[PDB]
Amino acid sequence: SKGEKLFTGVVPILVELDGDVNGHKFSVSGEGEGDATYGKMSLKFICTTGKLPVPWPTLKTTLMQCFARYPDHMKQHDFFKSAMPEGYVQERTIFFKDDGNYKTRAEVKFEGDTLVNRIELKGVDFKEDGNILGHKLEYNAISGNANITADKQKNGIKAYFTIRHDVEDGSVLLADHYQQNTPIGDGPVLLPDNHYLSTQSKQSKDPNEKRDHMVLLEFVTAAGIPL
């Protein structure tokens, strides 16, 4: 696809998130640049409705795998880039153990020159005193592997992985992600063989930013097929 070509230089990123967890509505915008050759994303995320009613780290996976660096020999398995510019739908259920789940739906596509990630997120039945709504999560960078497999009956892909979140009482809150992605356009796409994306994240704060925010630097690289 020509879509792989759309990603050879640096690409402006816009992220929009409409959320709702146990009623508390919130919104997060994100702005930055992705440079897929290096697998790099640099982004700043702000909560535009005031304080964020969940921990940022729990929103990280939801807030562009099209920006991953596919080794040249794996590039026949790059579904994300093949779907562009029409984009793809990315849905997830994220099951936090001993607490509620988030259901998320997003469209990742080009709008003019910009890569837009548009998200609806929705969580119910969380514990008002659990470690999410009571803000009891530590603020660490989330790294790990997303495990990809073709889903040919749906012309797209699925992923599955578990993020481990360090809690403040010294414990671990496990978050099981079940992902499904399906192409928005009707063009041909690349339906990969099994592989994973390796993410290396660096989370920080702009000190002079006074709004609730998260500053991210990400590196994502595809792997698990040898040649």
CATH code for the domain in which residue 167 is found: 2.40.155.10
Indicate which technique resolved this structure: X-ray
Resolution (A): 2.5
Tokens of 201: 């994240």
Where does the chain show beta strands of DSSP type E? 10-21, 24-35, 40-47, 88-96, 101-111, 114-123, 144-151, 156-166, 172-183, 195-204, 213-223
Expressed as residue numbers, the domain containing 218 is 1-227
Domain count, the chain: 1
Name the DSSP letter for residue 192: -
Residue partners of 170: CB distance under 8 A and separation at least 6: none
Pairwise CA distance, residues 39 & 219, whole Å: 5
